[PDB]
Amino acid sequence: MPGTKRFQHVIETPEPGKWELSGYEAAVPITEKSNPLTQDLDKADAENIVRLLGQCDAEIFQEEGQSTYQRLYSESILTTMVQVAGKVQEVLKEPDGGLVVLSGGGTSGRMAFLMSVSFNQLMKGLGQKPLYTYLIAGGDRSVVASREGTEDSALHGIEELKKVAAGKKRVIVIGISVGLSAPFVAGQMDCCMNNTAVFLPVLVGFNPVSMARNDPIEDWSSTFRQVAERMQKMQEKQKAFVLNPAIGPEGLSGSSRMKGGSATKILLETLLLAAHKTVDQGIAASQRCLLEILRTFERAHQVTYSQSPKIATLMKSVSTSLEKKGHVYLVGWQTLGIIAIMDGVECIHTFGADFRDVRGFLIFTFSQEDFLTSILPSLTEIDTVVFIFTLDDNLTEVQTIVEQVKEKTNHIQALAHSTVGQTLPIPLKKLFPSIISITWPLLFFEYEGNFIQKFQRELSTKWVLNTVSTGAHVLLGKILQNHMLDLRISNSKLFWRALAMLQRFSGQSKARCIESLLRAIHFPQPLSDDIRAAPISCHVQVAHEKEQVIPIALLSLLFRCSITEAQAHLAAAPSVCEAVRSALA
């Protein structure tokens, strides 16, 4: 019948109580799983929220059991990291015609950008020509934009790759897809494997290859899984590498911007930084140089979450201000301001947020008097402003801005990073009662910019902002257990997550879940056989433009009613969330 092949590969909903015994749980990609830790994330008070996420973040460094999946510290993973370091050296010693591309969609693209710059800086601080570049799906504007649709073409990945790679004779392509999912990266990897004379592909994500996506990609013939499997075969002869430790589920299910993005920086900062440090010394990069770096990042989690109490407070404030229809400002310097901007933008697609709700500023790129003349005017009693900087920053700029903002609102807070024994100028201190200062131990360091200190700081801020933005929205009641039910379907991945979420919460067959989702999407059009057989992109393109699709679908299924009926009931409920929970009892 129509739609049987489109949906053939969706696993059937199990019968009640047998989610485990059917083998269904074992098939959920680690990156899509419900993290047992956060099953009641929707009931946790702010303090618990910080704790539960700091703990989800911790799983990044948790060791492999004695049967189960390789992790970061597993010997097979570290070996792979060393051999890739190795290949990145060959290219470092031959910089004419050599290039290193970091590539992904969404937050994977954003991570790739930050790291391309950092390592380009390093090469320059040492007077050598920069060999790094990045690619992000949808081009360079995607870096600071919510543009979830752009990851779904393999040809557009290959195109961007052929662009930045022309003329070059040795290119290392680091494709980053947390879920081993993005067609944008899959095409790059396959192109690489078709021309190894020039290309060395390296795939980075956090599922076993047996859980890589196996869906048809609409402009292409292999699936991400086949690609990743061909890469794996090639690794024995060292012409492709798959670097894919399990780090455990996200605290918020499928929100791969969180642990996935952090583990991405962790994993590649470590490996690339080792690669540089050790070319100098004329030594093979070793499992032990990586280890040093890895353990440092691991201390960095402990140091960051030492400050948990004031992380929770900042959260409580961010939430209150969102709850009163107010807005949130994340102001910060150099690289930390970027991260601030990446985080606010990600709340748009993650939580259904207006871009003003949580937004970031680099000193988007609106600097001193400009910020004070444009943004400063229109503030309010109820708004929250966060200042994010290090004690190596233009602290004059800082205190100026804090001052004027002080008058507009009281809900300021700061995130301040120091080397131990640095101190706050006291006009800055008195301006923040409960300041969040993270003081870093002294560490020995090879290079001028002290890159290992940037990496620590960037990561620690990422964790703080991710945890704040995410738990603020959970406090508002927007999250259902540990799932974001009411997401906007803007790509094929998100279509499949919507469907799976409808199987999970309704408990009903796949045939019905699919029907109810396609009806909610395409309403007022009825389900014809064309619609049933359409490619997934046609569903996406229509769902992208609507509201509450997935809750309308769930209601229809829970009441056994039409879309007309479920819509009227959702309109008669106090809120989306109230209606859904209600129906679920």
Ligand X SMILES: O=P(O)(O)OC[C@@H](O)[C@@H](O)[C@H](O)[C@@H](O)CO
Residue from 80, 153, 181, 567 binding ligand 2WZ (CB under 6 A)? 181
Subset of 175-204 contacting ligand X (CB under 6 A): 177-179, 181-182
Q: Is 365 annotated as a binding residue?
A: no
Exactly one of 41, 500, 542, 550 binds ligand 2WZ (CB under 6 A); that residue is 500
Instruction: State how far the Cα of 253 lies from the Cα of 548, in Å rounded to an integer.
Output: 19
151 is a site residue for ligand X (CB under 6 A): yes
For ligand X, which residue of 257, 277, 417, 462 counts as binding (CB under 6 A)?
Answer: 257
Q: Taking CB under 6 A as the rule, which mask of x and - marks residues 12-41 in contact with ligand 2WZ?
A: ---------------xxx-xxxx-------
Rule CB under 6 A: choose which of 151, 215, 250, 357 binds ligand 2WZ. 215
Is 403 annotated in a binding site? The answer is no
Cα distance between residue 321 and residue 468, in whole Å = 13
Q: Any idea what DSSP says for residue 255? A: -
**Residue 175 phi, psi (nearest 5):** -90, 125
Neighbours of 554 (CB within 10 A): 29
**Residue range at the interface with ligand X (CB under 6 A); choices 159-167, 217-225, 256-264, 362-370:** 256-264
Question: Per the annotation, does 106 bind a ligand?
Answer: no
Question: In the complex with ligand 2WZ, which residue's Cβ is closer, 180 or 436?
Answer: 180
Single out the segment in contact with ligand 2WZ by CB under 6 A; choices: 290-298, 335-343, 396-404, 500-508: 500-508
Q: Cis (ω within 30 of 0) for the bond into 524?
A: yes
228 contacts: CB under 8 Å, gap ≥ 6:
180, 189, 203, 209, 212, 242
The number of angstroms, rounded, from the C-alpha of 118 to the middle of its chain's C-alpha atoms is: 19
Which of positions 332-361 make contact with ligand X (CB under 6 A)? Answer: 346, 349-350
Residue (207 or 307) nearer to ligand X, CB: 207
Q: Would the annotation count 509 as a binding residue? A: no
- Give me the DSSP letters along 202-232: EEE-SS-GGGS--PPPTT-SS-HHHHHHHHH
Cα 252 to Cα 113: distance, rounded to the nearest angstrom: 24
- The reply to whether 227 sits in an annotated binding site is no
Count the residues of the shown chain that bind ligand 2WZ, applying the rule CB under 6 A. 26
Bridge partners for 32 per DSSP: none
Containing 134, the helix (H) or strand (E) segment is: strand 132-136
User: Taking the CA atoms of the chain, what radius of gyration do you get in angstroms?
Assistant: 24
Position among 256, 278, 384, 516 found at the interface with ligand X (CB under 6 A) = 256
Determine phi and psi for 485, rounding to 5 degrees.
Answer: -65, -45
Number of neighbours of residue 408 by Cβ within 10 angstroms: 17
| Alpha-carbon gap, residue 388 to 382, rounded angstroms | 20
Total chain residues near ligand X (CB under 6 A): 19
Confirm or deny that 151 is annotated as ligand binding. Answer: yes
Q: Quick one: 452 or 549, whose CB is closer to ligand X?
A: 549
Q: Candidates 191, 212, 431, 489: give the one binding ligand 2WZ (CB under 6 A).
A: 212
Q: Which residue, judged by CB position, is nearest to ligand X in the bound state?
A: 106
- Using CA atoms, how far residue 135 sits from 74, 116, 177, in Å, is 29, 10, 12
CA–CA separation, 530 vs 200, rounded Å?
Answer: 42
- In whole angstroms, how far apart are CA 349 and each of 147, 544, 550? 8, 11, 14
The response to whether 493 counts as a known ligand-binding position is yes
Report the site for ligand 2WZ in 439-468 (rule: CB under 6 A).
none
Q: What is the Cα–Cα distance from 518 to 526, expressed in whole angstroms? A: 9
Q: Decide which of ligand 2WZ, ligand X, none touches 222; Cβ closer than 5 to 8 Å per partner kind.
A: none
Smallest distance, Å, CB 252 to ligand X?
A: 8
Q: If binding is defined by CB under 6 A, does position 517 make contact with ligand 2WZ?
A: no
DSSP, res 34: P
Stretch that binds ligand 2WZ, among 74-82, 348-356, 358-366, 499-507 (CB under 6 A): 499-507
Nearest approach, Cβ of residue 34 and ligand 2WZ (Å): 5
Of the candidate residues 497, 519, 522, 569, the single one contacting ligand 2WZ (CB under 6 A): 497
Closer of 27 and 584 to ligand 2WZ (Cβ): 27
Binding mask of the shown chain, residues 98 to 117, with x at each position contacting ligand X by CB under 6 A: ------xxxxx---------
| 179 annotated as belonging to a binding site for a ligand | yes
b/e 356-365 (16+ beta carbons within 10 angstroms → b):
ebbbbbbbee
Q: Give the interface segment with ligand 2WZ, choosing from 5-13, 50-58, 185-193, 318-326 (CB under 6 A).
A: 5-13
Q: In what order do the strands lie in the sheet with 384-390?
A: 358-362, 328-332, 384-390, 412-419, 436-440
* Residues making contact with ligand 2WZ (CB under 6 A): 9-11, 27-29, 31-34, 179-181, 207, 211-215, 253, 493, 496-497, 500-501, 504
Point out the annotated binding site: 107-108, 151, 177-179, 346, 493
Indicate the annotated binding residues for beta-D-fructose 1-phosphate.
107-108, 151, 177-179, 346, 493
